């Protein structure tokens, strides 16, 4: 009766079902966990918000078209405005979190296409001016739940002030490496003939036990159309991709007044 | 070495000291606690924010003058805009909390005066129009950290629409009972010759295990000048009263989107 | 509903409510649907991003035809009243497309689901009363 | 002849009954019967359905 295709995930007051999954990935074979006393750093008693924040938050959906080049988000950035997770994040200097990432995209037995879904530690991307290096604004690096998109062209700016955004060039993974090698990162593929969802469970990954969430994104989430969407009755059709993410084993230190980042 | 006058209280990242206390009150002899399974009601796993919210928050200070008639606050109303406590309060349908209330008022060995500090369960107060009964607006009932003041005169409104506030008449405790009997409620006195602070530890008190914090205040805090402030070199002098309150054993159920109450 | 009719012979109710949904499109139709229960006291949800902050389930349409969403017992009072009443308000149930329903050609593009309600084993009622659902002339 | 039984609890014991009549139809209400089997209406299926398993396999 039980199947690699059928799964339920419950966190807090939220549950996901899927009937066309393809197993699930646990990044680097490691489930998230709380920070042990023998690896701890800040000494204040941490806040562990548990069910208030460790639950599924669904981002705005994006549309997959035959011309789409792909999508990216950063974490914890994408969830910074999400319920009590966002509040705990911004009221504290330090935070750590794992995640369950659930990417959703259904179609029909007559559609075709394949999405690569990658979780990338320290997903540093190229800037869009050749007058400077590493020249990206905080606002452009941290778009929040809207994330960003890839392009198949690189057109760096004429003036440095106008190029302070990512050059998210698809085939170079926005960072000077070939996209065909992205499979070295934890990943699944949503191949429409096979499955309608991808599930990745991510431990906290960093060179530190805990860090400043408002300064530093630990993971990138990349969705690339490896094989273009095609549907014979209407090649211009669009199907939604929906991203739902739950923080896990969240832990925060260094409580004070709330952080309100710059918006422009 | 140890003394009834000298105390330290630490909750979360916050500590209070006093060197002229007068013991401390534990209301009805009961320390606050979490809600036991055998008395529980809502069935969702609760959020217990612990150190993020169970910590001392200091309200805006008020000035005690020879003409002051007194001050009131409600709880959890007075703390609704306080850090992560306020966030947890408003993101949930249900909440419960105990409190440590620490009232602070120092002067000199040459000043005199006495403040009664009372914690009142279900502190229902009279309205200020005789055209209606129980006719108080949500906004006037819930002033937040600014609280309200008592008056020594009762002047109900000419029109019902203008009297939708409390008639906080001092000698009737704003509710039709004689203020001299307020000592049946948990209390201390700040008598300037003796002490400079009052400390009251309050359990959750209600006819329910847990309730809607945004609808219902469990406690009133009343500060009444029982003996007027006097200072011979300047009878018009003013000394601050500062109220610092820590939620304790906070527990919340029924997570959803954030409650944003009406402001006018 | 059957539950509603029984409740109207009582004054008080308590417990969890079960909402089960049966998708009745064609086998070729796929989709993901969000079903949510938001306990009361905040802005009623009219968008998916508010609804998903409450108790919810994401239903993937497929071979298993039906999905159950629970409104768990989450209340201030130990019983709610079997009347419209602000004090014992129960909150908000909503539903949104999580992705969308997708069909291939030669397939109906509109269809239906059926919603059912029932009480859970934690559910009970008190205080027998006459119903307002039956009457006669005199 | 006297039956002693537990009362339904109130705000904050036992009670005694004696039947006075020769016909059981004369008796007071039947004692509380908490018997139930909702499954005869909620799950009257021939083959057992395990909740955690697929309903259709």
């Amino acid at each position: 009766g039980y199947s690699d295709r059928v799964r339920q995930i419950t966190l807090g007051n939220s549950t996901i079902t899927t009937q066309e999954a393809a197993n699930a990935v646990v990044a680097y074979g490691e489930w998230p966990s709380y920070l042990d006393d023998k690896e701890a750093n800040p000494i204040d008693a941490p806040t562990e918000p548990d069910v208030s924040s460790n639950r599924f938050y669904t981002l705005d959906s994006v549309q997959w078209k035959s011309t789409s080049r792909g999508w990216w988000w950063k974490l914890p950035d994408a969830l910074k405005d999400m319920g009590m997770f966002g509040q705990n994040m911004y009221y504290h200097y330090l935070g750590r979190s794992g995640y369950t990432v659930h990417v959703q995209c259904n179609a029909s037995k007559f559609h075709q296409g394949a999405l690569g879904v990658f979780a990338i530690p320290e997903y540093v991307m190229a800037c869009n001016t050749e007058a400077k290096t590493s020249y990206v604004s905080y606002v452009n690096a941290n778009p929040g739940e809207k994330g960003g998109v890839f392009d198949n062209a690189y057109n760096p700016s004429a003036e440095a002030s106008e190029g302070r955004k990512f050059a998210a060039l698809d085939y170079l993974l926005g960072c000077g490496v070939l996209a065909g090698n992205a499979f070295v990162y934890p990943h699944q593929i949503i191949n429409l003939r096979t499955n309608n969802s991808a599930t990745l469970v991510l431990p906290y990954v960093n060179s530190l036990a805990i860090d400043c969430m408002a300064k530093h994104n630990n993971w990138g989430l990349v969705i690339l159309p490896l094989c273009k969407l095609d549907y014979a009755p209407n090649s211009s059709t669009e199907i939604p991709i929906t991203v739902t993410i739950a923080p896990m084993f969240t832990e925060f230190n260094g409580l004070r007044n709330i952080t309100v980042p710059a918006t422009q | 070495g140890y003394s009834d006058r000298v105390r330290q209280i630490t909750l979360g990242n916050s500590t209070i000291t006093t060197q002229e206390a007068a013991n401390a009150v534990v209301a009805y002899g009961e320390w606050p606690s979490y809600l036991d399974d055998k008395e529980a009601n809502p069935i969702d796993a609760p959020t217990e924010p612990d150190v993020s919210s169970n910590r001392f928050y200091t309200l805006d200070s008020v000035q005690w003058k020879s003409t002051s008639r007194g001050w009131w606050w409600k709880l959890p109303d007075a703390l609704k805009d306080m850090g992560m406590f306020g966030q947890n309060m408003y993101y949930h349908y249900l909440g419960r909390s105990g409190y440590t209330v620490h009232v602070q008022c120092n002067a000199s060995k040459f000043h005199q005066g006495a403040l009664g500090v009372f914690a009142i369960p279900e502190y229902v107060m009279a309205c200020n129009t005789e055209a209606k009964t129980s006719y108080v607006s949500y906004v006037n009932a819930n002033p937040g950290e600014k609280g309200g003041v008592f008056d020594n005169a009762y002047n109900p409104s000419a029109e019902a629409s203008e009297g939708r506030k409390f008639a906080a008449l001092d000698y009737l405790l704003g509710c039709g009972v004689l203020a001299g009997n307020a000592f049946v409620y948990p209390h201390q006195i700040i008598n300037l010759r003796t002490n400079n602070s009052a400390t009251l530890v309050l359990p959750y008190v209600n006819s329910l295990a847990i309730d809607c914090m945004a609808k219902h205040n469990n406690w009133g805090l009343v500060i009444l000048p029982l003996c007027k402030l006097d200072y011979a070199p300047n009878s018009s002098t003013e000394i601050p009263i500062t109220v610092t309150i820590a939620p304790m054993f906070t527990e919340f159920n029924g997570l959803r989107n954030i409650t944003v109450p009406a402001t006018q | 509903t059957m539950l509603g009719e029984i409740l109207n012979y009582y004054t008080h109710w308590t417990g969890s409510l079960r909402f089960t949904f049966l998708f009745c499109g064609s086998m070729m139709a796929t989709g993901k649907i969000l079903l949510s229960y938001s306990p009361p006291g905040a802005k009623p949800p009219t968008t998916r991003k508010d609804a998903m902050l409450g108790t919810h389930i994401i239903w993937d349409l497929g071979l298993q035809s039906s999905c159950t969403m629970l409104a768990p017992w989450i209340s201030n009072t130990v019983y709610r009243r079997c009347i419209k009443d602000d004090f014992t308000e129960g909150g908000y149930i909503t539903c949104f497309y999580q992705t969308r329903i997708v069909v291939p050609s030669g397939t109906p593009t509109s269809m239906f689901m059926l919603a059912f309600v029932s009480a859970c084993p934690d559910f009970s009622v008190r205080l027998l009363r006459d119903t307002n659902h039956i009457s006669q002339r005199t | 002849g006297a039956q002693v039984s537990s009362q339904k609890v109130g705000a904050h014991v036992n009670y005694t009954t004696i039947n006075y009549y020769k016909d059981s139809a004369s008796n007071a209400a039947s004692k509380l019967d908490f018997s139930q089997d909702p499954s005869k209406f909620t799950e009257p299926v021939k083959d057992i359905m395990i909740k955690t398993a697929p309903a259709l396999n």
């Binding site: 199947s3 339920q8 549950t15 | 069935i43 | 389930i57 039906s66 159950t68 084993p121 934690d122 | 955690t52």
Partner: peptide, 27 residues
């Protein structure tokens, strides 16, 4: 006899899917 108590439970990530069923069965 009482109505049902609620047990302490956390989350799941599992091939057990009690949320789905098929009411065509008559259940």
């Amino acid at each position: 006899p009482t109505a049902q108590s609620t047990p302490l439970t956390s989350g799941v990530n599992s091939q057990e899917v009690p949320a789905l069923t098929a009411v065509e069965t008559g259940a």
